[PDB]
């Protein structure tokens, strides 16, 4: 008890998993302790093998009577893995060797087996060996042996097949090869970086090809030479002219490994009408972009968009004929021929400088519209869509077409001013975010992280780059040893934070000349990287030596640096003299100061109006002090990184404080007091005091609380492209093509993953009315995703390390999909644990042999903490619910179960399809679809030929991302419907479950992890400040609220350049923003597209 332990013991050092389960069942019949006639007292029944076997492997053993619940299982698993190894890939002989002994009486039998099943083997031997006629896969297993009584062909088949009952998707499909699954030795990285031109080809192994890396270099160079000589010419030329019109499928095509870009410009010969060679202005030109690679990222996307679109067209024509055999015609339109042709014509017009033949025309009228400025018009044609004023038509299920954007925002689940400062800052910080994203995408692709077998990936592969870029900034010796293609991200981070620093020390670089130094401790001269300590790292440290332990640790860890450097010893005393004390500073003064300033991080969770700059305690936190239990304890472990919830959550607070400073003065005291003292003075009855509440809102928006808004990326990009179509008539077509490919990929994913996956096909995506009792399951499923986002440790090197500290269904290969499925199935398991325990009981979990990381007492507790906070169940969501030392045990229980049962068997099965849970079955069927696709003819023949466990990773990652995207939206849709008036108004339910909205919901949602930087941080233009004009104008006569109003609203980078930068945007700015923020949903490497293609078409539509 129970197979959860076997799942973790059989994935180590071996082994056919089902072998351990069968051996345990036969030798014990599932009894924890044991005794026997022959002597052995244990689950695997060993008494002779106590000392030698325990000692010989990963974990050692102690006495006879203490045969451990895990140490014994792992020892026997290692013995059986040796028996499988010591003979051959013939597990049956290993089983016989275990049962009959290796070397006693038995050894003749083991040798006797080597001559056929025989009779030299005996009563228990042959029968027990026959019992394991399941997996696998010895010749003697087919040789042991040797309607019902009918001849007739059927009969022969029935009596020969003999069902196997075992399958490891990891021995028969993707076999871990030598070169893949090799973490790189710290020295070999130095050779790969110098003797490989592009590391992407270290993966592809056609051979071969060991040993060793001195051969892989010779191969990945010669293949890169063979690529740029011919692959380019052939692919580009063949698809460049006439991708549709030509036009091919391509459904039966070479795996298409080599191609990247390159020489792919689709000047369809024909479809070019008037070919004005030159230019309309100095705009136009080509993609107006400011990143290098901007003409190749686009190209890559296009090859990958065109191939995928033409393939979806061909496969929808094929499934059309697959349905013609039932009925000759229903309507079957069906398909994307429209969007793909209108995209090919746009591309040709972009590359050939004229002839926009993809323009519907024209009339009328431009009603109704109109989400933001742009008026559209609905064409009675293919579902949707809109037509523009040009009118360049936008296919439905696109992130731009304003009809869909409305439908989604509809029913579904002198010197001046402050506002000018906010726009200048939000216009320069978006640019530096884009420049940081470029360098991060360029660094997270160096050999360490990708070429070799997977290691930390991938939410960690950005965390362990930002960790280096932060620890190099703060102490500069460590710098000096950083990879160059990665030092350019440390440079940009340091420059960005240094510019914010140089601008906060004297924020008078603006209209006003007052407002002095918002910054906390000027004279502490270093690029201040924001010290923002974590919630969960503090939880782990307050679990053992809870309160005074951490309160003394963060104190003495700073006291170490206070005496370990000669200059911080000066810059602390320079601060201490000024506050309290004459020149001589007693070492008790610094002790009390450090203690009281560490208490701020010890007890109250201030760090995860006022701000968080304030935690810029003057000490340096690098040295670790030893805790009384032995573990060295620094403060950088309490700190945080990852520039994802840090950089854009620090930049907004800093930009708010800077703008309020440039208005008149300090944010807290000044602003607050004054705005309130207009409230509490004038007054309850005052008709124009709601207009004072209007200005309080200006304050909130500017400061950056922002009312969790920034509704969507896309409602901004809509007006962005509408206005871009005026001046730049080439980037206009570029930005339409990229977004059109973006919408087509996701609207293909909705169709495919709707036909293929069972939970989605007959219920979630089903129109109406209601799942009868699955409401009680949908509530818990959604509450699971709520509680996970409320509890999960918001880091990356604290989750996988905590998960592996206890030691497709295997994170060693195709880690991208395994990460999504882990961070998916965990919410299902968690919500199931909450709902079961809630009121009413179902304790499958409480009685578990998966009792690791959760003892009887912690498990029981995870129960009362769950019971105290919710009722049949969106209840709390409370601050005390998270700041609970026992609440991390719930997260750990859930994640360990989700990685022990739901996601680490090497075969999908009938485990929980008549059991928990609603999301559990969805992720189980997603893993089932992953294995089913990974066994297709296309994909298996592509792996065997080229290996490349990274390409199928980047293929099966997008599928599962968009799939969970659609799933989490569809599940909430039914709940909101059941909250719509129960008088059936499910026509509303229908208005929100259709592939023209699911494809959109699977875009502006669904992290989408791990990505350097974020989708929102890269586009956004916060506009008004309409009510601000209202207040300014209407209080013009009124009193003094006016006197406040002309302050806030109107009617690379050094600190001097931020001020000079324009305050709205540049066409290149939004262009690079759109070209970057879409790389997380339209890939670049054009072969993962055509892999996704064959994965979809094998599944169906």
């Amino acid at each position: 008890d129970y197979d959860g332990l076997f799942q973790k013991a059989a994935d180590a050092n071996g082994v056919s998993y089902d072998l351990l389960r069968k051996v345990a069942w036969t030798e014990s019949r599932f009894v924890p302790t044991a005794k026997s006639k022959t002597g052995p007292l244990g689950m695997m029944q060993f008494t002779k093998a106590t000392a030698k076997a325990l000692g010989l492997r990963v974990t050692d053993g102690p006495d006879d009577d203490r045969l451990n619940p895990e140490l014994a299982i792992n020892a026997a698993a290692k013995q059986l893995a040796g028996l499988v190894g010591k003979f051959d890939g013939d597990e049956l002989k290993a089983a016989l060797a275990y049962n009959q002994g290796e070397g006693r009486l038995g050894n003749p039998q083991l040798e006797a087996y080597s001559k056929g099943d025989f009779a030299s083997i005996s009563e228990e031997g042959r029968n027990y060996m026959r019992n394991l006629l399941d997996v696998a896969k010895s010749p003697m297993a087919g040789q042991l042996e040797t309607a019902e009584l009918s001849n007739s062909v059927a009969g022969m088949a029935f009596r020969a097949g003999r069902l196997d009952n075992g399958f490891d998707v990891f021995k028969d499909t993707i076999t871990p090869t030598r070169w893949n699954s090799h973490i790189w030795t710290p020295e070999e990285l130095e050779k790969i970086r110098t003797e490989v031109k592009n590391p992407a080809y270290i993966n592809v192994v056609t051979g071969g090809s060991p040993e060793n890396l001195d051969d892989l270099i010779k191969l990945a160079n010669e293949n890169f030479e063979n690529d740029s000589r011919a692959a380019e010419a052939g692919l580009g030329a063949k698809l460049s002219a006439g991708i549709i019109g030509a036009g091919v499928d391509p459904l039966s095509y070479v795996p298409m490994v080599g191609v990247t870009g390159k020489g792919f410009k689709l000047i369809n010969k024909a479809l070019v009408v008037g070919a004005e060679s030159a230019a309309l202005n100095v705009a136009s030109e080509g993609l107006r972009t400011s990143v290098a690679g901007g003409d190749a990222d686009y190209a890559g996307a296009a090859l990958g968009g065109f191939v995928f679109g033409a393939g979806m067209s061909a496969i929808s024509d094929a499934v059309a004929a697959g349905l013609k055999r039932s009925k000759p015609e229903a309507e079957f339109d069906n398909e994307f021929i429209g969007p793909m042709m209108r995209l090919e014509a746009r591309e040709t017009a972009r590359n050939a400088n004229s002839a926009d033949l993809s323009r519907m025309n024209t009339e009328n009228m431009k009603f109704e519209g109109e989400h933001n400025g742009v008026p559209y018009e609905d064409l009675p044609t293919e579902r949707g869509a809109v037509v523009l004023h040009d009118g360049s038509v936008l296919s439905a299920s696109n992130p731009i077409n304003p009809k869909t954007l409305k439908e989604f925002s509809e029913v579904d689940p002198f010197g001046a001013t402050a506002s000018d400062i906010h726009e200048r800052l939000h216009g320069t910080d978006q640019r530096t975010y884009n420049d940081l994203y470029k360098a991060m995408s360029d660094a997270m692709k160096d050999p360490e992280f990708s070429t070799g077998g997977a290691k930390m990936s991938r939410e960690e592969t950005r965390y362990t780059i930002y960790r280096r870029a932060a620890l190099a900034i703060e102490r500069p010796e460590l710098q000096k040893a950083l990879t160059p293609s990665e030092r350019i991200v440390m440079d940009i981070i340091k420059r960005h934070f240094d510019t914010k620093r140089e601008l906060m020390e004297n924020p008078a670089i603006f209209g006003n000349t007052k407002a002095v130094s918002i910054f906390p401790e000027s004279r502490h001269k270093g690029t201040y990287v924001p010290h923002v300590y974590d919630r969960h790292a503090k939880a782990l440290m307050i679990q053992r030596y809870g309160a005074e332990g951490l309160q003394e640790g963060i104190a003495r860890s700073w006291m170490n640096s206070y005496v370990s450097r000669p200059e911080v010893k000066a810059r602390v005393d320079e601060m201490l003299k000024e506050l309290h004390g004459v020149k001589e500073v007693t070492p008790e003064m610094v002790e009390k100061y450090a203690m009281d300033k560490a208490y701020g991080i010890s007890h109250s969770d201030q760090f995860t109006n006022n701000s968080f700059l304030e935690a810029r305690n003057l000490f340096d936190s690098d040295l670790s002090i030893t805790m009384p239990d032995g573990q060295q304890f620094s403060v950088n472990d309490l700190r945080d990184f990852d520039m994802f919830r840090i950089m854009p959550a620090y930049d907004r607070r800093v930009n708010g404080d800077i703008a309020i400073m440039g208005s008149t003065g300090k944010t807290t005291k000044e602003l607050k007091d004054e705005i309130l003292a207009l409230k509490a003075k004038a007054e309850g009855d005052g008709k124009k005091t709601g207009e004072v509440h209007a200005l309080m809102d200006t304050v909130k928006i500017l400061t950056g609380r922002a009312r969790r808004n920034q509704d969507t990326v896309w409602e901004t990009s809509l007006r962005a492209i509408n206005d871009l179509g005026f001046f730049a008539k080439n980037a206009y077509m570029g930005a339409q093509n990229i977004t059109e490919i973006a919408g087509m990929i996701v609207t293909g994913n909705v169709r495919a993953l709707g036909h293929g996956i069972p939970i989605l096909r007959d219920t979630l995506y089903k129109s109406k009315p209601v799942s009868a009792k699955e409401l009680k399951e949908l509530h818990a499923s959604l509450f699971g995703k709520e509680v996970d986002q409320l509890i999960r440790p918001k880091r990356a090197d604290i989750v996988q390390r905590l998960r592996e500290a206890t030691d497709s269904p295997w994170t060693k290969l195709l880690n991208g999909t395994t990460n999504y499925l882990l961070d998916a199935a965990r919410q299902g398991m968690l919500g199931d644990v909450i709902s079961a325990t809630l009121t009413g009981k179902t304790t499958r979990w409480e009685k578990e042999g998966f009792l690791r990381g959760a003892s009887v007492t912690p498990e029981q507790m995870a129960g009362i903490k769950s019971l105290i906070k919710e009722h049949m169940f969106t209840v709390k969501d409370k601050q005390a619910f998270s700041m609970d030392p026992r609440a991390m045990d719930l997260w750990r229980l859930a994640d360990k179960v989700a990685d022990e049962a739901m996601l680490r068997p090497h075969k999908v099965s009938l485990q929980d399809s008549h059991a928990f849970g609603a999301l559990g079955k969805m992720v189980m069927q997603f893993k089932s679809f992953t294995i089913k696709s990974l066994n297709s003819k296309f994909l298996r023949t592509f792996y065997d030929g080229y290996k490349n466990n990274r390409a199928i990773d980047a293929a099966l990652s997008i599928i599962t991302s968009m799939g969970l995207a659609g799933g989490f939206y569809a599940m909430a849709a039914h709940v909101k419907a059941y909250a719509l008036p129960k008088e059936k108004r499910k026509e509303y339910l229908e208005r929100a479950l259709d592939p023209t909205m699911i494809a959109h919901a699977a875009l502006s949602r669904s992290s989408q992890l791990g990505a350097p930087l974020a989708m929102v941080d890269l586009v956004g233009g916060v506009l008004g400040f309409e009510s601000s004009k209202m207040a300014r104008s209407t209080i013009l006569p009124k009193d003094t609220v006016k006197e406040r109003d002309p302050n806030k609203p109107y009617t690379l980078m050094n600190a001097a350049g931020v001020v000079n930068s324009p305050n709205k945007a540049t066409e290149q700015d939004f262009m690079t923003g759109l070209m970057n923020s879409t790389k997380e949903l339209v890939p670049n490497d054009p072969l993962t597209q055509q892999l996704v293609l064959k994965i979809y078409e094998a599944n169906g539509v």
Binding site: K137, P139, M156, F158, R159, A160, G161, F167, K932, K937
Partner: protein, 150 residues
């Protein structure tokens, strides 16, 4: 081309030879592929699916499907393997032909629906000997009513 791409394994190990040999003769690299493909055709059945596409589900070697000891027997055995692959597809509804694969090994004809659940082995010894007894007593019935005329 189905057969070359899914190259069944034993035959792949031979395959490498014939290609390198034929190339050293007169103008090659088509003549070479020509001979290699005609050889692999002379030596492995391609099991096609009932669907009208009709995409191949396997390449199982014409030597190892042999019931008994002569190749007329290989042919007769193909008539066992197809009955087996069919019973599965109808029996477990939803295993559409596109889903099923037949995969060999050193010496075993193995048969899997893509989800790992359904997977029947088929082996020289048992296929052979089952067909032997079945042909035996069916031929007995044949003798019985054949001599019943006399």
């Amino acid at each position: 081309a189905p057969e070359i791409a899914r190259m069944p394994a034993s035959l792949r190990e031979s395959a490498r030879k014939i290609y390198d040999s034929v190339k050293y003769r007169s103008g090659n690299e088509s003549m070479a592929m020509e001979q290699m493909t005609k050889f692999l055709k002379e030596s492995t059945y391609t099991f096609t699916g009932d669907d009208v596409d009709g995409d191949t589900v396997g390449v199982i070697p014409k030597n190892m499907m042999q019931v008994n000891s002569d190749p007329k027997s290989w042919e007769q055995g193909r008539d066992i393997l197809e009955e087996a692959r069919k019973g599965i597809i109808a029996s477990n509804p939803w295993i559409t032909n596109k889903q099923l694969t037949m995969y060999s090994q050193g010496d075993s004809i193995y048969l899997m629906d893509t989800t790992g659940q359904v997977r029947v082995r088929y082996d020289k010894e048992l296929l052979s000997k089952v067909w032997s007894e079945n042909q035996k007593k069916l031929e007995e019935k044949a003798r019985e009513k054949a001599l019943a005329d006399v």
